[PDB]
């Protein structure tokens, strides 16, 4: 069963979502975001001293 | 045996090729015994005899 959600980019706040499938009892999920990291690509040119 | 009061509720239905329906019926019976069941329509078939 496919379920799609959107969560804002806030660290340290829980969010909840409801899953509903006909014929079955509803289910609730809870998610929390702990960290996000960005990493650039670098190339060296020259050094000084 | 005789039955004097009955009611019906239907918590789920999916009209698939298989037995996808369930119903619950309440009854009051005058004494212990066995009883047969039968449907009064052509569009609905019941498994239990």
Experimentally determined by = cryo-EM
Residues of B with CB below 8 A from A22's CB? Answer: 12, 14
For chain B positions 1-49, those within 8 Å of chain A (CB to CB) are 12, 14
How many CB pairs below 8 Å do chains A and B form together? 4
Looking at residue B49, the DSSP 8-state letter turns out to be: -
Q: After which residues is chain B broken (C to N over 2.5 A)?
A: none
What whole-number distance in Å separates Cα of residue B42 and Cα of residue A4? 41
| Contact between B21 and B39 (Cβ < 8 Å) | no
The string of DSSP letters for A2-45 reads: -------S-TT--EEEEE--TTS--EEEEE--------------
| Side-chain-side CA neighbours of residue A18 (13 Å) | 4
| Greatest C-alpha distance within chain A | 73
| Contact between A31 and A18 (Cβ < 8 Å) | no
Nearest CA in chain A to B10: A23
Residues of A with CB below 8 A from B14's CB? Answer: 22-23
Phi and psi torsions of A2, nearest 5°: -90, 135
């Amino acid at each position: 069963y496919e379920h799609v959600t959107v969560i804002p980019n806030t660290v340290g706040v829980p969010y909840k979502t409801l899953v509903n499938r006909p014929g079955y009892s509803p289910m609730v999920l809870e998610m929390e975001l702990q960290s996000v990291t960005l990493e650039p690509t670098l190339s060296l040119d020259y050094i000084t001293c | 045996p005789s039955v004097t009061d009955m009611s019906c509720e239907v918590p789920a239905c999916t009209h698939s090729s298989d037995f996808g329906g369930v119903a619950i019926i309440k009854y009051t019976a005058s004494k212990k015994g066995k009883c047969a069941v039968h449907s009064m329509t052509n569009a609905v078939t019941i498994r239990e005899a």
